[PDB]
Each structure stands twice: as structure tokens, then as C-alpha cells.
Amino acid sequence: RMKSHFQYSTLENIPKAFDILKDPPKKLYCVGDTKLLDTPLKVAIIGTRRPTPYSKQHTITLARELAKNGAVIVSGGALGVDIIAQENALPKTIMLSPCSLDFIYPTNNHKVIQEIAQNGLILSEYEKDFMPIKGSFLARNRLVIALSDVVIIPQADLKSGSMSSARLAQKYQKPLFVLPQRLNESDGTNELLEKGQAQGIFNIQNFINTLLKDYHLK
Numbered sequence: 140r141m142k143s144h145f146q147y148s149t150l151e152n153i154p155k156a157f158d159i160l161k162d163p164p165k166k167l168y169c170v171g172d173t174k175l176l177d178t179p180l181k182v183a184i185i186g187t188r189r190p191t192p193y194s195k196q197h198t199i200t201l202a203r204e205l206a207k208n209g210a211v212i213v214s215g216g217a218l219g220v221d222i223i224a225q226e227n228a229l230p231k232t233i234m235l236s237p238c239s240l241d242f243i244y245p246t247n248n249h250k251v252i253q254e255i256a257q258n259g260l261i262l263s264e265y266e267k268d269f270m271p272i273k274g275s276f277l278a279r280n281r282l283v284i285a286l287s288d289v290v291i292i293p294q295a296d297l298k299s300g301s302m303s304s305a306r307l308a309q310k311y312q313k314p315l316f317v318l319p320q321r322l323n324e325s326d327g328t329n330e331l332l333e334k335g336q337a338q339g340i341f342n343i344q345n346f347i348n349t350l351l352k353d354y355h356l357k
Contacts, residue, residue, distance in 0.1 A: 186220030295327035
């Protein structure tokens with residue numbers, strides 16, 4: 140277990156976005172810039188722990204360009220898509236931690252997570268001495284989806300964390316987007332397209348510009 144040695148406090152108010160939850164957190168612990176919560180466009184970017192170079196390249200562009208234009212990238216700091224997006228969105232990014240803020244998880248991402256604590260924002264539902272179990276990740280995911288205006292899943296397999304979060308975006312009526320992927324690659328996101336549960340990002344520039352326009356950043 141890795142201690143963060145973060146100094147952390149609590150949010151004054153629970154963000155109104157969490158009202159759509161059945162059991163919204165009544166306290167949220169925080170480290171970093173809470174002003175990131177008062178922005179017009181929050182974009183969740185989540186997905187596989189193992190992205191292809193293709194998926195990575197486009198995750199980077201989305202995160203970097205959206206952040207450049209005042210969008211805030213929301214994720215869970217996981218290996219793969221999450222931590223790629225958040226590093227490339229700094230400092231405009233918010234991590235929802237699956238552990239309490241006195242701990243780092245995952246340890247491999249400690250460098251970027253420390254960067255997020257310093258320049259972005261990390262929130263946790265858990266006060267102290269709390270390491271994630273399976274149920275913790277799932278609860279954390281609801282926070283990521285509820286807080287975000289729109290959700291992007293660049294790449295995912297069927298039966299993956301990203302897929303339960305995709306059904307949450309559907310549940311919480313958040314617009315869901317995926318990268319185009321070849322057949323028999325990224326079966327999760329291709330099944331989302333197939334069932335019409337997600338829309339494809341068939342041109343990255345248009346998606347970004349359209350997105351920034353609808354939320355009036357540009």
C-alpha cells in the first residue's frame with residue numbers, strides 16, 4: 140500500500156450533478172483545485188487498461204484539445220485510457236478515487252496522480268484507511284458518470300469496467316461516445332454502436348468543435 144501524504148479536506152457542497160444518484164454522497168473529500176467543479180463542460184474519458192496505439196493516440200488528442208478549450212476531463216485514474224487522458228488534460232482534470240485520499244491507487248500511476256493532486260482535483264467518497272474492493276470501483280464509477288456531462292469510451296472489451304459504466308451513462312442519460320474500431324477489436328464499444336447505445340466519433344475535429352459549441356466554450 141502506498142501512502143499519498145496528501146493534505147485533504149472536504150467539499151463545502153456536494154455538486155448538484157450528484158442529485159441524479161439514488162444514494163448521492165453526503166460528504167466528498169478533496170485535494171487540489173475545487174474550482175474545476177464550476178466549469179460548463181465535464182467530459183468523462185474511461186476505457187480499457189490496455190489501449191492500442193490507435194486508441195491511445197486519439198485519447199490523447201481528445202483529452203488535450205478538450206482541455207485546451209476549457210473542458211475538464213473526468214476519470215478514475217486507472218491504468219490505460221484513464222491515466223492517459225488525465226495526464227494529457229492537466230491541469231483541467233478531476234479524478235474520482237477508488238481509495239481514500241491518504242492512499243495512492245494504482246501505485247504505478249503515482250507520478251501522474253500526484254500531478255493531479257497538485258494541479259487538478261481528486262475527490263473521494265472515503266475518509267481514510269480505505270483501499271478499494273470490487274464494490275468500491277463500481278461505486279466510484281457512478282460518481283465519474285454522474286458528474287460528467289458527456290462520456291467517451293475510446294476502447295473496451297465486453298464485460299469490462301467500462302461496460303458497466305456505459306450502462307450507467309445510459310441509466311443517467313449521459314450522451315455516450317466511442318472511437319470507431321474494426322470488427323472483432325474493442326467488442327464492447329462496437330456492441331454499444333450496434334445496439335445504438337453509443338454514438339461514434341467518426342471525425343475527431345467535428346466531434347470536438349460540436350461539443351465545445353453545444354456547451355459554449357468556443
